[PDB]
Design a protein around this ligand. Structure first.
Ligand SMILES: *Cc1c(COP(=O)(O)O)cnc(C)c1O
Ligand SMILES: *Cc1c(COP(=O)(O)O)cnc(C)c1O
Lengths: 387, 387
């Protein structure tokens, strides 16, 4: 059972078959491939509506720009955080209205600002006086959001000057945004950011702006590996929002989650293409995706990946010190430096879960190695819910 | 004046106009762009024929796979070092015969080995017993080259065992390859590798192979920044080749240069899209290519880039501590951490020379930021010579 829409095919899971079961079915040229569970994205959306009922999510497209993902999120009602002309074209090309887009790049090429003005995208961020000069010339009627620091972010000591400069240029400033990021292992950083945002809203009132938009950014975890759970963060954000930004004020609260929505939806299957033995003693395994491909996340996103075997465990099997390398002819294309694994063979598969964020979006075809095909799946109940 | 061939356009330089002059002419949307001097590649080829007259160069396609570069090198007579099916398809698609290709990837996917066998590519490298098992099944008549260590490389202590295993499998082993790499700042490492290769040729004679192919790998510098000059390396390699591999023996010597041929041929022009001032005191400049794009070389190739201004110097201008950042909405997309520069403005260009190697080949469109267009140029004298 399958369905087609927005130039993608999606298999519908019927019994109690899960995305993991489909993966096994495909394994039962042997190029690496992904199984992407669109149902996991709807699950994440329901969980978001429950945890942060006052906060509208604007998906950060740069995390994973796969057409099916963006199509799915659009269908379920998210907004989009776009940072370039291409990202805006992607979202508008899927039928999403300009009002559901925030151009949340504080430092934008002037031609790309002109593109947003021409296509009706009015909401953009900024954090510098030169950005205001550019907006004055290229999108004078835009609705600006001041990005504050917790590369980017205006200090509280310098925000007042920017707000006065915006008023001098007759630019409307409608709110404040911040981005804590995923590195943070403390929910209190989000709380302090909300408090800093309220200070800036009050400064803006003194300058003559009646701000109404609070954007709490991204960094929410999308996988279970992370120590700090999503609901540990949201449970402390909610009281801060109620304290500093009561609903009676007319304020609109939004966020820019990326990895939250898509990290766990993608599982990557790679095949063991080559193998060396350094003396049964230690083993080196070469696989058909690597650091120039999906595992660029180890270098750009500081991600921590974990190799899982696809075959079922065996009683009392022996474990050996092993290393896992990518397919390129580059000595630094190494995925796992040292791990303990049973003896594996060429043609065997290894699985890498929680591979949806900052993976496919930044992969290249360096050395001619192609991108893994992505197979989409969705449970029957989730398929019905989306419609 | 221009010419077209193999789906690319090339401007012919007429007066005493140089690639740098064309760059200035184009500057006189403002997207980043490259100027690639195909004449510089022919210059590099002439310099190679002079410096290493007994060594046939097999260009390492993975360095820079731009169609015009591969087309040019084919036209002037190089061989090609390919590491994947896609790379082989590229070279054969430009009309290069299988005899001018080495499949110099020691750890290859079995389907890709089958592809090479089907398309007549017989010469491949290896460095492990499992690789021999794969070749026995998928390309039994291949001509193998043993890659020795100076991820890859058989030790001298383990090469004899491999050679015996190849004989047991009725696999023909025709030679030895090594790869010193570009990190090396000493020409004596190349000399020791040649001596180690001769030890392996003698071991192979004892086992029953009459080796004839010596492959000296890559790592030769393609830019003037490098301390160790090309001719400093070649001047010590030649006597080693004459000592250990006399021409009277019938030996064929080849190499796999990548960066040598193309590093200096490409100059990247980026525009300053955004700017911040941290207090006239210090300046932060944002440009329209970055670490997910052309400057991935800083992370993957450990490259050292240097920002040059495009505008002409002015008398007694003031210099300031500055930082240069890429266009993405990623806090680590930083190109130059600290440098001293005059005050620059949005719309001004910065130039990055010696940007041909390991740059465009590994760039992505992460965050929607597009790849810079490449404009090809060639002097009149070089155009004539190539034909
Ligand atoms: C990348 C980024 C996001 C998305 O971050 P996640 O960690 O994927 O949630 C949101 N906003 C900004 C400004 C970003 O730079
Ligand atoms: C990458 C590489 C080359 C090319 O290296 P350069 O430093 O670009 O010359 C040649 N041979 C092998 C085996 C390589 O891995």
């Amino acid at each position: 059972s399958s369905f087609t829409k927005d130039e993608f095919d999606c298999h519908i899971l019927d019994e109690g078959f899960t995305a993991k079961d489909i993966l096994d079915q495909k394994i039962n040229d042997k190029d690496a491939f992904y199984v992407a569970d669109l149902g996991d994205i709807l699950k994440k959306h329901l969980r978001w509506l429950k945890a942060l009922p006052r906060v509208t999510p604007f998906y950060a497209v740069k995390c994973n720009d796969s057409r099916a993902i963006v199509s799915t999120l659009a269908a379920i009602g998210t907004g989009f955080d776009c940072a370039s002309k291409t990202e805006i074209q992607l979202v508008q090309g899927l039928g999403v209205p300009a009002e559901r887009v925030i151009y949340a790049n504080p430092c934008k090429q002037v031609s790309q600002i002109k593109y947003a003005a021409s296509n009706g995208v009015q909401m953009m961020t900024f954090d510098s006086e030169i950005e205001l000069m550019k907006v004055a010339r290229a999108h004078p009627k835009a609705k600006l959001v001041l990005r504050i620091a917790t590369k980017f972010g205006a200090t509280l000591k310098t925000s007042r000057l920017l707000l006065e400069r915006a008023k001098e240029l007759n630019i409307d400033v409608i709110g404040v945004s911040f981005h804590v990021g995923s590195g943070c292992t403390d929910p209190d950083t989000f709380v302090q950011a909300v408090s800093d945002a309220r200070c800036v809203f009050d400064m803006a009132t003194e300058v003559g702006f009646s701000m109404h938009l609070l954007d709490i950014g991204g960094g929410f975890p999308g996988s279970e590996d992370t120590k700090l759970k999503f609901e540990e963060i949201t449970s402390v954000i909610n009281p801060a929002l109620d304290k500093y930004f009561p609903s009676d004020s007319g304020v609109r609260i939004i966020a820019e989650p990326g990895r939250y929505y898509v990290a766990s939806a993608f599982t990557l299957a790679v095949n063991i293409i080559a193998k060396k033995t350094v003396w049964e003693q230690t083993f080196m395994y070469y696989v058909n995706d690597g650091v120039y491909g999906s595992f660029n996340c180890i270098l750009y996103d500081h991600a921590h990946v974990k190799a899982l075997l696809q075959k079922r465990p065996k009683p009392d099997e022996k474990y050996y010190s092993s290393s896992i390398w990518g397919p390129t002819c580059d000595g630094l294309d190494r995925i796992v430096e040292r791990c303990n694994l049973p003896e594996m063979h060429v043609g065997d598969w290894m699985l890498f879960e929680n591979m949806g964020a900052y993976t496919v979006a930044a992969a290249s075809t360096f050395n001619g190695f192609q991108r893994p095909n992505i197979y989409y799946v969705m449970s029957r109940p989730m398929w019905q819910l989306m419609k």
